[PDB]
Design a protein around this ligand. Structure first.
Ligand SMILES: Cc1nnn2c1-c1ccc(-c3ccc(N)nc3)cc1N(c1ccc(Cl)cc1)CC2
Length: 109
């Protein structure tokens, strides 16, 4: 699938050194206990992160680009739901989503 190759390219870019200064909070699943966020899993019903997206891509879990996009956008939405809007991590999410949305928009079709 041409479109899933494009998705995989986006994924690689989101994980690349170019964006690491703001992407790193999204690299792994939120470890709420380790971070002291003992209300995280009461607020967030469907955790998501880039390592999970990568695993799903490697396992051929995604059947289309929209399913991939749904997971990436869910990851950002969780950040916007859990954190106050002026939190540093929300600023990082907005920057990484801008990277994602502009390249996702270039999807071959
Ligand atoms: C994703 C996500 N969505 N909401 N949060 C996080 C998040 C996820 C992982 C980490 C993390 C911490 C340490 C570490 N070694 N690895 C990873 C930190 C997070 N937060 C967070 C706070 C502040 C700054 Cl500036 C950035 C990040 C706030 C909580």
């Amino acid at each position: 699938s041409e479109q899933l190759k494009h998705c995989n390219g986006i994924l690689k870019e989101l994980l690349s050194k170019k964006h690491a200064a703001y992407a790193w909070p999204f690299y792994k699943p939120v470890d709420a206990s380790a971070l002291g966020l003992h209300d995280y899993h009461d607020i967030i019903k469907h955790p998501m992160d880039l390592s999970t997206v990568k695993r799903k891509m490697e396992n051929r879990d995604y059947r289309d680009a929209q399913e991939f996009a749904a997971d990436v956008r869910l990851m950002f939405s969780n950040c916007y739901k859990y954190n106050p809007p002026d939190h540093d991590v929300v600023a990082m999410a907005r920057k990484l989503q801008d990277v994602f949305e502009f390249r996702y928009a270039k999807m071959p079709d």
